[PDB]
Structures are given as C-alpha cells and as structure tokens.
Amino acid sequence: KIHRPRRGSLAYSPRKRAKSIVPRIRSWPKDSEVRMLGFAGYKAGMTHILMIDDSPGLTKGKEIFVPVTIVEVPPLFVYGIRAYKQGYLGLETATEVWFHDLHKNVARRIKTLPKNYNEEAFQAKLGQLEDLVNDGEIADVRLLVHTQPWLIGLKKKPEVMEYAIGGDDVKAKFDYAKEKIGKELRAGEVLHEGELLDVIAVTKGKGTQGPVKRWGVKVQFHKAQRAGKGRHIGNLGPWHPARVMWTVPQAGQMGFHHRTEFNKRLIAIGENGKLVLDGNEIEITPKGGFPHYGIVRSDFLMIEGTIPGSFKRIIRVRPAIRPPKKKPPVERPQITYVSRESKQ
C-alpha cells in the first residue's frame, strides 16, 4: 500500500460561479476605535519597490524587493443608516433612513427612488430613528454607502454596499453615523498606514476546465496517452457503494469564485495620483499607462503582494480579522525606489 494526500481541498465546495460580482462580507472584526470598518476601490495594476525591512524575522533592517498592487479609491458617499434588532434566531433589520438628495446615476442601480421626500421629512425620520435607538431595543447600527465611479471616468453605474461601525455602544455608533450621513468619505479618514488588511473580490474567470488543472490530477502513463485517456482520471470509484461519490474529482467551472485573503500590509496612501517620498511628488502611473487600465488621477492604496481579481474589478477591504501575534509597526516604511517604467 502507498499513502499520499488527496488531490485538492474540500473546503471551497461547491466550486460554482459567484452569486454576484460585488463581494459580500460575512464577518467583522472587533475594534475599539469607533470608525467605519472598511473601504472599496478598483484594481489598477502592479509594480515593485525597494524598501527597508521592518517586520520581525531575518532580513530585518535590509533593503529588499517587494511586489506591490495599486487600488484606485475615489471617495464614497453615505446615503443611509440602518438599525438592527435581535429576533428569535439572529439579527433582523428594524428600519432604514435615507438621504433626500442623491446623484442622478444612483437610479441605474436603484430603479425606484422616492418622488418628493424633502429635507424636513428626512429630519423627522432621523428623529424617529434616534428616539427608537435611545431606548435599549437596538443592537447594531450600519452605514449604507455607494461608490462614485464617474469621477474617474470608468463607468456611471455605482456599486451599493453596507458597512459596519466599530465600538460597543449603539449610541456612539449612531452619533458617528449621524455626523456622517449625506456626505463624501475618504480613505485617509478610515485607514491608517501600516495596517494589516483582508481583501475580498471575485477571482478571474477561466471557464470549464478538466481535473488536471482544476484539482491537480496526474497525467496518465504514455500508453494511456496513446490510448485516449491521458488527461482523464482512472475510475469514479469502487463496486460498493454502487454510486459516484461527491469527493471524486471532475470537470466543471473554474475561476470566478468568492475568495478572501489574510494579512496584506498597507504600505502608503496616495492623493491625486502622487506619492511623496523625500519631499518630491512622483507619479505611480508608469510611462505609457497601466496595461488595460489608464491613468490614476484621484487617490490610491499601495498594498503588498497580490490580490484576487481582474484589473477593473471592484475590491473590498477590511482590517485584519485574524492577525498574527508579532505585527509590524503601524507606520509607513522607508522606501528607497519606486518603479514607474513601462509595463507592457
């Protein structure tokens, strides 16, 4: 008998097409600072830098090559506040409050907007929600946010999302939300340079693939390659049980999956397309523009490593639900070189 591990993981099944291109966040981290727990942007491209190492471990204090991804982040708009209560099993929405003046383009996602809904009505609804929250029934408060893709001329149909707030007092959360609603919100007010983040997006699509590539199955002997079975698995199982088991590798959809990554470091936050290294203001956009993505012009995040998704895809970010015990400092590192040469 020969032993070896099975081919592929069963933890990401069923391997099907994602429900939506806009990714959903299932869990939130416990933070003591009262702030919005995430942001959203669009992926632009990749480059590399040379920085002085900070994190614990060998290589500390030396100049190292580091791959980098760039995410364009125009400001979000806060258009609503939601209240949650506790039902029999879990949380259930108690009520919603919206802002009265919304951009003309929001109707491309939300086809049915209210007709008149003036400011005094909005304020009365805010007051009702305030008094409701001021009793003790309510358990959680969340913000309702929409992207503004028209500033960077990428498209006009926004993405609409819900974001949680940190802390442990509903009243503090509500004060924050009431001071935020109806306005534009920037990434520098939410994120801190040097943090660890979790990124969420839908992966690149690859269509239907066979088991060699979908599961890491082996290619058969060359006699079978000449017989007509090279890229096939041997058998679907034994005589008894007299059925095919769900654990047997098979062909199907590959790519376009919901996936989450852990502990990617935020290096720097840029403004208006520039980064400030040593007093200078340099452009991240390489000579000729990013391939399949043009010029960065509003604001951008520099994230260490790689992240799921194609280029113009929507990315969501949250802070470190599962960080290690020896975190690196929350401070922008010392950067000696940023590459902005042609990338095609």
């Binding site: 590399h48 040379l50 100049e63 090559f65 000696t336 070189y337 590459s339 040469e341």
Partner: protein, 62 residues
C-alpha cells in the same frame, strides 16, 4: 537602489531587473535582457548594431 550597466548594449537598467553572469575565473557580467544575453552567447557583434554604444565607439574608430 543603484542602476546597473549592461555589458552588451551599454545602457542603464533599473533595480530589481536583469541578470548577473559569473565565469569560473571570477569575471562578472551584467545583462538587462535575455535578448542581450542570447546575442552575447551566440556571438553577434554589437559594434555593428546601431542601437548600442559600441556602435558610436566603432564610428569614432573608423
């Protein structure tokens, strides 16, 4: 964060790129591209190629 100089085309290439070749006699060489590496090893003459600096060298040597 120093820029290196290629031993075939003579141009500067950026940190984080290229190749260093070592001969068993300690002699070192720097390449910016597989193009230049391959041309060096096959034996194309850069003094004849109008996109190198050895070409201006030879143009003076005329």
């Amino acid at each position: 964060a120093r820029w290196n100089v290629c031993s075939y085309c003579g141009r500067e290439f950026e940190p984080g790129t290229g190749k260093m070749f070592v001969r068993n006699d300690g002699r070192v060489l720097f390449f910016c591209s597989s193009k230049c590496e391959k041309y060096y090893f096959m034996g194309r003459n850069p003094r004849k190629l109008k996109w190198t600096k050895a070409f201006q060298e030879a143009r003076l040597q005329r």
